[PDB]
PDB file of C-alpha atoms in Angstrom:
ATOM      1  CA  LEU A   1     -55.840   6.087 -51.416  1.00  0.00           C
ATOM      2  CA  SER A   2     -59.259   5.855 -49.770  1.00  0.00           C
ATOM      3  CA  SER A   3     -58.173   3.377 -47.082  1.00  0.00           C
ATOM      4  CA  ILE A   4     -56.266   6.095 -45.181  1.00  0.00           C
ATOM      5  CA  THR A   5     -58.636   6.821 -42.308  1.00  0.00           C
ATOM      6  CA  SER A   6     -58.518   9.137 -39.332  1.00  0.00           C
ATOM      7  CA  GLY A   7     -60.473   8.373 -36.177  1.00  0.00           C
ATOM      8  CA  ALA A   8     -64.186   7.730 -35.943  1.00  0.00           C
ATOM      9  CA  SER A   9     -66.471  10.246 -34.287  1.00  0.00           C
ATOM     10  CA  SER A  10     -68.195   9.915 -30.935  1.00  0.00           C
ATOM     11  CA  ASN A  11     -71.993   9.957 -30.743  1.00  0.00           C
ATOM     12  CA  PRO A  12     -72.578  11.484 -34.188  1.00  0.00           C
ATOM     13  CA  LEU A  13     -76.342  11.640 -33.822  1.00  0.00           C
ATOM     14  CA  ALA A  14     -76.195  14.234 -31.042  1.00  0.00           C
ATOM     15  CA  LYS A  15     -74.072  16.542 -33.182  1.00  0.00           C
ATOM     16  CA  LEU A  16     -76.499  16.237 -36.084  1.00  0.00           C
ATOM     17  CA  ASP A  17     -79.389  17.132 -33.772  1.00  0.00           C
ATOM     18  CA  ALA A  18     -77.537  20.190 -32.491  1.00  0.00           C
ATOM     19  CA  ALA A  19     -76.911  21.383 -36.044  1.00  0.00           C
ATOM     20  CA  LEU A  20     -80.566  21.002 -36.998  1.00  0.00           C
ATOM     21  CA  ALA A  21     -81.482  22.991 -33.885  1.00  0.00           C
ATOM     22  CA  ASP A  22     -79.290  25.924 -34.862  1.00  0.00           C
ATOM     23  CA  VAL A  23     -80.813  26.012 -38.342  1.00  0.00           C
ATOM     24  CA  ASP A  24     -84.446  25.964 -37.286  1.00  0.00           C
ATOM     25  CA  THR A  25     -83.772  28.628 -34.666  1.00  0.00           C
ATOM     26  CA  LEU A  26     -82.546  31.008 -37.334  1.00  0.00           C
ATOM     27  CA  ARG A  27     -85.464  30.283 -39.668  1.00  0.00           C
ATOM     28  CA  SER A  28     -87.911  30.989 -36.849  1.00  0.00           C
ATOM     29  CA  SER A  29     -86.379  34.398 -36.185  1.00  0.00           C
ATOM     30  CA  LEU A  30     -86.613  35.300 -39.867  1.00  0.00           C
ATOM     31  CA  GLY A  31     -90.313  34.446 -39.950  1.00  0.00           C
ATOM     32  CA  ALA A  32     -90.872  36.663 -36.925  1.00  0.00           C
ATOM     33  CA  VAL A  33     -89.235  39.644 -38.622  1.00  0.00           C
ATOM     34  CA  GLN A  34     -91.422  39.227 -41.712  1.00  0.00           C
ATOM     35  CA  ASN A  35     -94.541  39.276 -39.549  1.00  0.00           C
ATOM     36  CA  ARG A  36     -93.308  42.536 -38.079  1.00  0.00           C
ATOM     37  CA  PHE A  37     -92.652  44.137 -41.411  1.00  0.00           C
ATOM     38  CA  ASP A  38     -96.096  43.703 -42.997  1.00  0.00           C
ATOM     39  CA  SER A  39     -97.995  45.789 -40.416  1.00  0.00           C
ATOM     40  CA  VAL A  40     -95.886  48.827 -41.268  1.00  0.00           C
ATOM     41  CA  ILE A  41     -97.013  48.758 -44.896  1.00  0.00           C
ATOM     42  CA  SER A  42    -100.624  48.704 -43.778  1.00  0.00           C
ATOM     43  CA  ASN A  43    -100.111  51.471 -41.224  1.00  0.00           C
ATOM     44  CA  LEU A  44     -98.279  53.801 -43.581  1.00  0.00           C
ATOM     45  CA  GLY A  45    -100.924  53.412 -46.266  1.00  0.00           C
ATOM     46  CA  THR A  46    -103.677  54.436 -43.882  1.00  0.00           C
ATOM     47  CA  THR A  47    -101.711  57.380 -42.495  1.00  0.00           C
ATOM     48  CA  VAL A  48    -100.898  58.654 -45.986  1.00  0.00           C
ATOM     49  CA  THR A  49    -104.565  58.602 -46.925  1.00  0.00           C
ATOM     50  CA  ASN A  50    -105.547  60.626 -43.873  1.00  0.00           C
TER      51      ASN A  50
ATOM     52  CA  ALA B   1     -82.644   5.672 -33.918  1.00  0.00           C
ATOM     53  CA  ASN B   2     -80.138   6.815 -31.263  1.00  0.00           C
ATOM     54  CA  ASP B   3     -76.925   5.854 -29.526  1.00  0.00           C
ATOM     55  CA  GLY B   4     -76.321   2.586 -27.720  1.00  0.00           C
ATOM     56  CA  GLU B   5     -79.286   0.614 -29.069  1.00  0.00           C
ATOM     57  CA  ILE B   6     -77.577  -2.681 -29.790  1.00  0.00           C
ATOM     58  CA  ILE B   7     -78.863  -6.243 -29.615  1.00  0.00           C
ATOM     59  CA  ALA B   8     -76.025  -8.715 -29.251  1.00  0.00           C
ATOM     60  CA  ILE B   9     -75.624 -12.288 -30.522  1.00  0.00           C
ATOM     61  CA  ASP B  10     -73.456 -14.948 -28.917  1.00  0.00           C
ATOM     62  CA  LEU B  11     -71.721 -16.932 -31.721  1.00  0.00           C
ATOM     63  CA  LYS B  12     -69.484 -19.507 -30.097  1.00  0.00           C
ATOM     64  CA  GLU B  13     -66.688 -21.263 -31.977  1.00  0.00           C
ATOM     65  CA  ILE B  14     -66.746 -24.843 -33.258  1.00  0.00           C
ATOM     66  CA  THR B  15     -63.955 -27.056 -34.559  1.00  0.00           C
ATOM     67  CA  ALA B  16     -62.954 -30.677 -34.173  1.00  0.00           C
ATOM     68  CA  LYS B  17     -60.458 -29.488 -31.561  1.00  0.00           C
ATOM     69  CA  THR B  18     -62.897 -27.512 -29.417  1.00  0.00           C
ATOM     70  CA  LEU B  19     -65.426 -30.328 -29.013  1.00  0.00           C
ATOM     71  CA  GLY B  20     -62.595 -32.348 -27.462  1.00  0.00           C
ATOM     72  CA  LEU B  21     -62.435 -34.875 -30.286  1.00  0.00           C
ATOM     73  CA  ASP B  22     -58.765 -34.499 -31.213  1.00  0.00           C
ATOM     74  CA  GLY B  23     -56.841 -37.701 -31.815  1.00  0.00           C
ATOM     75  CA  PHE B  24     -60.037 -39.740 -31.547  1.00  0.00           C
ATOM     76  CA  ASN B  25     -59.471 -43.293 -32.724  1.00  0.00           C
ATOM     77  CA  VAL B  26     -60.188 -46.985 -32.362  1.00  0.00           C
ATOM     78  CA  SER B  27     -58.211 -50.196 -33.099  1.00  0.00           C
ATOM     79  CA  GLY B  28     -55.258 -49.107 -30.958  1.00  0.00           C
ATOM     80  CA  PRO B  29     -51.699 -48.610 -32.182  1.00  0.00           C
ATOM     81  CA  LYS B  30     -50.735 -50.098 -35.542  1.00  0.00           C
ATOM     82  CA  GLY B  31     -47.142 -51.124 -34.793  1.00  0.00           C
ATOM     83  CA  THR B  32     -44.090 -50.436 -32.704  1.00  0.00           C
ATOM     84  CA  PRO B  33     -43.736 -46.663 -33.069  1.00  0.00           C
ATOM     85  CA  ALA B  34     -40.734 -44.501 -33.904  1.00  0.00           C
ATOM     86  CA  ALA B  35     -39.376 -41.366 -32.283  1.00  0.00           C
ATOM     87  CA  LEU B  36     -40.686 -37.820 -32.723  1.00  0.00           C
ATOM     88  CA  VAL B  37     -39.118 -35.532 -35.277  1.00  0.00           C
ATOM     89  CA  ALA B  38     -39.518 -31.864 -34.396  1.00  0.00           C
ATOM     90  CA  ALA B  39     -42.133 -31.309 -37.106  1.00  0.00           C
ATOM     91  CA  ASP B  40     -45.143 -32.880 -35.398  1.00  0.00           C
ATOM     92  CA  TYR B  41     -44.723 -30.550 -32.426  1.00  0.00           C
ATOM     93  CA  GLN B  42     -45.714 -27.519 -34.480  1.00  0.00           C
ATOM     94  CA  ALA B  43     -48.161 -29.711 -36.378  1.00  0.00           C
ATOM     95  CA  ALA B  44     -50.112 -30.215 -33.159  1.00  0.00           C
ATOM     96  CA  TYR B  45     -49.445 -26.842 -31.517  1.00  0.00           C
ATOM     97  CA  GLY B  46     -48.964 -24.404 -34.389  1.00  0.00           C
ATOM     98  CA  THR B  47     -46.006 -23.424 -36.525  1.00  0.00           C
ATOM     99  CA  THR B  48     -44.574 -21.000 -33.949  1.00  0.00           C
ATOM    100  CA  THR B  49     -44.621 -23.268 -30.901  1.00  0.00           C
ATOM    101  CA  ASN B  50     -42.012 -23.006 -28.155  1.00  0.00           C
TER     102      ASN B  50
END
């Protein structure tokens, strides 16, 4: 059954590159949000003390 | 590691027919010949000759 083939793709490497680009974009944004979040812990601790 | 990065090789085709050596002989004809049957036609030109 494995000889039944549809068409071959066109320029597969470009599509793979595009996929990798979407992924790393998202990971970058997540790292940014973490960097935001830490400062708030520090700030709130100081304000509570005062 | 991308598209369209080939390096091509030529690979011509060699047989006794291509070199031009078909029917090569010496000593001439052996005897008074006989007529053609239809078989040798497709023998020389392929089984589906016209």
